[PDB]
Amino acid sequence: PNVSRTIARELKSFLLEYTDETGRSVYGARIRTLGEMNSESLEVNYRHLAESKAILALFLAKCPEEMLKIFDLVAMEATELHYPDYARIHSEIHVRISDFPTIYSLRELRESNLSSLVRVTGVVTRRTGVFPQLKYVKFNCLKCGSILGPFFQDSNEEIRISFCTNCKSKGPFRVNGEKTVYRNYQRVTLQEAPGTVPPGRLPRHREVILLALVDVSKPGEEVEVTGIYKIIEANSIKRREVFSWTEEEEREFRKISRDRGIIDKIISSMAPSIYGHRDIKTAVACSLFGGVPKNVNGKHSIRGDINVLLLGDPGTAKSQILKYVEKTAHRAVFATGQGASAVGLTASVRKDPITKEWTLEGGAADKGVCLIDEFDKMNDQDRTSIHEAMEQQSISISKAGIVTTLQARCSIIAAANPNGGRYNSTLPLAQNVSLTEPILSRFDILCVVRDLVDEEADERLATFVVDSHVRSSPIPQELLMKYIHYARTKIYPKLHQMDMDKVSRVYADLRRESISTGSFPITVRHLESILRIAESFAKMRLSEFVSSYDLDRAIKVVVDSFVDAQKVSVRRQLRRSFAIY
Amino acid sequence: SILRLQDAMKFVKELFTVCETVLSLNALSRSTGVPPELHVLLPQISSMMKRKIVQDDILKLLTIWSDAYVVELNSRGELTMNLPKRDNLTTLTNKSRTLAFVERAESWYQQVIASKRRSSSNSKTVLSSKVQT
Amino acid sequence: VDDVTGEKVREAFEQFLEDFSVQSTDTGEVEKVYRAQIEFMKIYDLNTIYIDYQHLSMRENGALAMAISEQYYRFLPFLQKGLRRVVRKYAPERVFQISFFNLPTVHRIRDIRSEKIGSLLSISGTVTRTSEVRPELYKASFTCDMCRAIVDNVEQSFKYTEPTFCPNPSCENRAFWTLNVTRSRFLDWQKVRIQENANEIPTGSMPRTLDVILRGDSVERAKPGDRCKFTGVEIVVPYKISFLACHVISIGDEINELKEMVKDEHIYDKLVRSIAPAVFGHEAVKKGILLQMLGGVHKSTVEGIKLRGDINICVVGDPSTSKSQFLKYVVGFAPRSVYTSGKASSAAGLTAAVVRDEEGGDYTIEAGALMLADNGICCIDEFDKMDISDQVAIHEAMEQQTISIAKAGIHATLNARTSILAAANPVGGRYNRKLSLRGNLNMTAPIMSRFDLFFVILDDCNEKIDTELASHIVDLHMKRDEAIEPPFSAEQLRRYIKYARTFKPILTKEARSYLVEKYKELRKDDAQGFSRSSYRITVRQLESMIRLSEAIARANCVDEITPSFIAEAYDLLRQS
């Protein structure tokens, strides 16, 4: 149509007149940055041209495929009169339509959203890149040896050609792509995030096409993609990013956190199914609430996560707590063994059978919490990958033509069983578990349960589990899970050097007493752990800084984990820690 | 202490510019009808200004310009809004709506300042129609 | 002859849809609910309506239904045009799906002839395999050979079509236009495999299977490995006789005998000796097999997660026993029973292996014994000669009730509730009383767990019962002896199993107060043990006796359980 000719000259006049701040045309700086650095991506906010002309925004929302035939041409014309001979190196320059107001979900993708612009959130998986895909074909008929060709896009397998022109034969046909179209690949499968899916339903998944934006995306992270819907053809990608906090719920959270010591109420709200004991749930709540990451002049990155390790006889409950926190906590990933969930933590090059090739993928929650069940039953790859992720916070991929070091700042909640069923209390934990000391040193809290013969446990456990079967004060679950996301995304409580030096005095007693009576020592990692546990309790208390008695609970948490992880012969240490108890 | 001159003016008058483009983003389509709901509108304007948008700001936009947005509440509890025209908002009609909104805000600021530069207004929210019985 | 009959049947169908509104207040007179159904889908715009054939069979004394019923494929665009006209006049991107359901006759796969080609049919059976979802063409954009003009071509759901004349008189050729996918219209298409049910197979015949196609939003509803009932049109495929379905559903003196059998007092004693009349002795194994057919409540929670409310039964002992005979009885008597040999199985084989089809090299998912016969007994003979992969798949299927399959890019999880009858043997065959169950069974602790009851059978030379066993064996070897005969047949036992299955009892407070003391009494035996005691006692054995309590409550048909019937379950746990 000729109506595009009055559209073109309108936006050609628009790019030379957009002065939003202090009378400065930002498009001249944008065109000189794309021309000097040889870029092909042009950035246009939707609000700018929408404030200028809403009919262009309506045309972009209705027919973006024909609206994109004007944008690239006027961008190349602006780059050609701004820079001479730019067409010799770059023939086409695309545009990046950002700031889409109506962000859709993956379950709202319907038949009415066809051939239009849509901004969707998700998580990327299945990374296959830089391959020549098809769009046209040719075929060689072997009987007469002839050529015939149609079209083939990006959804079907291939359009079988079985009828020759003059052979009228059903002979064997061969694929000729030696006269054929250009190829560009980015087959990425995107999925819905688990932190915003409704309960009972399953997250959907789609396939996205990336062309002209390859390997700038990180698998296992949240992403925002703006593209057209037909299979989504992405135009813009954003690696920066329904259950969120509001203004009416944020005042009551400070009012709840100010009154009646809510740390124990959060602990009692953690396990509604059973009675339990506070040693598992205290470590669980401080691991899910986490600490703060700090660096000094861009280096010395400390891990802000807390990795807890559960141990005890297999008859007790260890998977129900992680099953409750998988629904409760945000971006919680439950992974298991060889690959129960068909997703893992380790990078891998492997063959794929759906299309029967070799591919590379770095598995997977960068801010979330990963839950590992049956920690002693694994191979060498998933032990070394979690040891690298527990040692430092990055996982490297060095295969299939790609080299990427991705962030691995995830918390680890692992559960295990000893060799033989019984805990065997007259031996230490290093002789009990099959694991060694440096993989045990990454886990700061080692919680362990035992068997209770006495009437007390018989009076409580059997009665609670029969109350759960005969039926067909704490903080509620919704306010608790909203408080987790509200406190983990807004505050960062530091520490002040006024009277904190006293913990360096008590560590000086507590280190020395572990040599003379005990066999296992205490190091600086325990000091880093109790400072993280104290700042996690200050985060849960929602204070400006860590108080003086948060370290008392932190030293109680480290004493009932380290002293309980040893023999019965460290019994004098049960009374030696009674002076600070 | 209203201080609306230092505060509300400029920020509130850009609410209509984002809101007029987001009601032509959904309601205007050649595919499958659909009624403009307030649950998918607040997040898009949240993307526009990057700031938190409370659902009462749209009610203030209704208070300054009443006849564009109908406040009727659906039976499901969600509060829908619509436009009087059925032939949809043209780009020229969108510019005329922006000029009418800025002219209406200038008229409210001009009439309210005779009591004493913006003088005193809190940009009072419009009364939302209550469900019967 | 149907060109003037199609407009009349379109007028009749729209008169049927126009003359019936809703006047259903106070359960008075009846009139159809279609206009409010269209008014409800006005917001969601899916247009995948459901029209009952029983509600359509009353107009024109059924004659309108009989004329539509044979010429359904020849009257289908007139019906969708009448539906389009009534939603265009009653309401202001347009796809439509009209589904018919609830036919009065259920037809098998062996009674399909060529006289019903194009007519509607109800096909019931079991789904064997499932394929991936694929985008079906719908309408394409053809370009000419010289005009380069766009033509919006509408397919007719048969095969790749092609126009005949160019609309612009710049050309009149008939050579090959080229296809175009920009202005094209895609959707979900699926091809599944239906097969003949196990209760209606002829004597000596083979259970002949067939492929059925499905479109609209009837896809992604049919779960693999379940009894299904489809309603559709018989369409031929180049030839082969396939089917097209539009509706999917997950189907699957008598009271004078049942009320007489629930009023006595010695029913359970004949039930434990009538659940396996061919086996001499072993009342405990018969008790666990009888209580392992019916379970308890699985949704006993306040959090929102389903629990394991089933009974797992595992038999061990020396070889050449009668423990496989129970295995041969369950599968010959229980309708929801799948038997496997164990060695002729694998991980994928047990639940869902993948096999290729050459039309496009595309995969289809074959099922198996696992995830079949829900709320029934899956019986695995030779449990210890299996691999590690299928046993951790069994453990993953027992840790959570759902099962997940991740293959070829697609992820699919489904509900599963089966009771495992595991037949195992030792590493040396002979059971020695020297050590524990763990070292003799030779399998790891998590797959040894989640098992409610273990049955150990040891044999020796005890002449008084041995001569009776050998006499019963030689008396059984004759033409239909009365020695085997039970006190009552299976004829009332099947409806008794179903009547006890739909009972759902509720435990009491006195039973719980006696149960906590019984658990303390059972855990007191662990103190100063190592005699008779052979395994550990924790929450799992407490859950096993809790699940056996509602099973004995259902077997005795009591709504509120007393602790005296749970005392027999306590004695059964003490006997093991």
Author numbering:
A (entry chain 2): 201 to 412, 414 to 431, 450 to 460, 473 to 595, 599 to 706, 756 to 864
B (entry chain 8): 303 to 418, 433 to 449
C (entry chain 6): 103 to 194, 260 to 405, 450 to 463, 511 to 834
Quote from the publication.
Helicase loading at DNA replication origins depends on the Origin Recognition Complex (ORC), Cdc6, and Cdt1 (3–7). Orc1-5 and Cdc6 belong to the AAA+ family of ATPases, while Orc6 shares homology with the transcription factor II B (TFIIB). Here we employed a previously reported Mcm6 mutant, which is missing the C-terminal WHD (amino acids 839 to 1017) and is referred to as McmΔC6 or “mutant Mcm2-7”. Here, we report two cryo-electron microscopy (cryo-EM) structures that capture helicase loader–helicase complexes just prior to DNA insertion.
Another helicase loading intermediate could be resolved, yielding an 8.1-Å resolution 3D map of the “pre-insertion OCCM”. In this intermediate, ORC–Cdc6 has a conformation similar to that in the semi-attached OCCM. Crucially, at this stage of complex formation, the Mcm2–Mcm5 gate is open. However, the width of this gate is smaller than the 2-nm diameter of the DNA, suggesting that the gate needs to be widened when DNA is inserted through the Mcm2–Mcm5 gate. Importantly, the Orc1 WHD establishes close contact with the AAA+ core of Mcm4 (contact site 3). Furthermore, in the pre-insertion OCCM, ORC–Cdc6 positions the DNA adjacent to the Mcm2–Mcm5 DNA entry gate, while also supporting DNA contacts with the AAA+ domain of Mcm2 (contact site 4 in Fig. 3 C and D). The lack of an Mcm2 WHD supports the direct positioning of DNA on the Mcm2 AAA+ domain, as observed in the pre-insertion OCCM.
